[PDB]
């Protein structure tokens, strides 16, 4: 519903993030017209966060734990699981669906 995940290339199928785990991710974010608004790949700097604890938008907290270590997927996130009516200033309009290409590179100390 709020986030849909499309698997593009599989991970190891056995290791999945649990609530409270720290994940390492390479991502590219796009609006629905396909335009890129941000990418950790382009700055050669993976993104790390604790997952499942509200430190990122709800679409990530709910979508990322579905991925197995090493998976590449696309998360499609509705505004209720993203930045809502406000959007994110300078970057994301209000009422925006978001498309993230996500590669799960690490779960705690485990690396893909």
């Amino acid at each position: 519903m709020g986030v849909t995940k499309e698997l593009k290339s599989p991970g190891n199928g056995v290791d999945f993030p649990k609530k409270g785990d720290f994940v390492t991710i390479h991502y590219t974010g796009r609006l629905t017209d396909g335009s890129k608004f941000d990418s950790s790949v382009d700055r050669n700097e993976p993104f790390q966060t604790q997952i499942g604890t509200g430190r990122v938008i709800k679409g990530w907290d709910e979508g990322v734990p579905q991925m197995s270590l090493g998976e590449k997927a696309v998360l499609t996130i509705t505004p209720d699981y993203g930045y809502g009516a406000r959007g994110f200033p300078g970057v994301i309009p209000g009422n925006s669906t978001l498309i993230f290409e996500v590669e799960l590179l690490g779960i705690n100390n485990k690396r893909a």
Binding site: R43, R86, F88, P89, G90
Partner: protein, 195 residues
Amino acid sequence: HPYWLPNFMDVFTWSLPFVGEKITDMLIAILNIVSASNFDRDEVDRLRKRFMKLDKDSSGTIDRDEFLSLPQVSSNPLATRMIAIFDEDGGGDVDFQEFVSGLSAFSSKGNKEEKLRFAFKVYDIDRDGYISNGELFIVLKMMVGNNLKDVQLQQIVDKTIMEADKDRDGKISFEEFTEMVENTDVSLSMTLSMF
């Protein structure tokens, strides 16, 4: 390889939503002159009871250890900044006048100017009224950790200062800061959401 924020945005627009989120997260944890504050006399009295529970040693002041006693505060990347800002006289601890004054800025009854001032104080570590290059780097680094390289943070700090520093002294005054952020929703970031 040059780095810029999405849409070449400035670091204040970029960081203020997270600043407001993290501080209001801590205020929620804590909540669960005085006569000129944004609180009626009744609400002030409720805060007196909240203050008393936090002061574990009955000093009339809350120190750093009593703030960090909350799990929601100790895990928070802006805990040190919030504590320093609440300590208005700079004496190491927050009395009740400082407790109420700090919370009053985040009221839905507060004005844009005092929320701009609180936001500015997040970055102005040494309280001299100017955000220096190093202060802006340090405070952004506190929030981003290893999610940007130091050289990437240096490029966007330097570009934002070049854009905001109207009189070209290498620092950002309060007036330069408020002009930089005049078309973003700073009040919203710096408000604890009302039921």
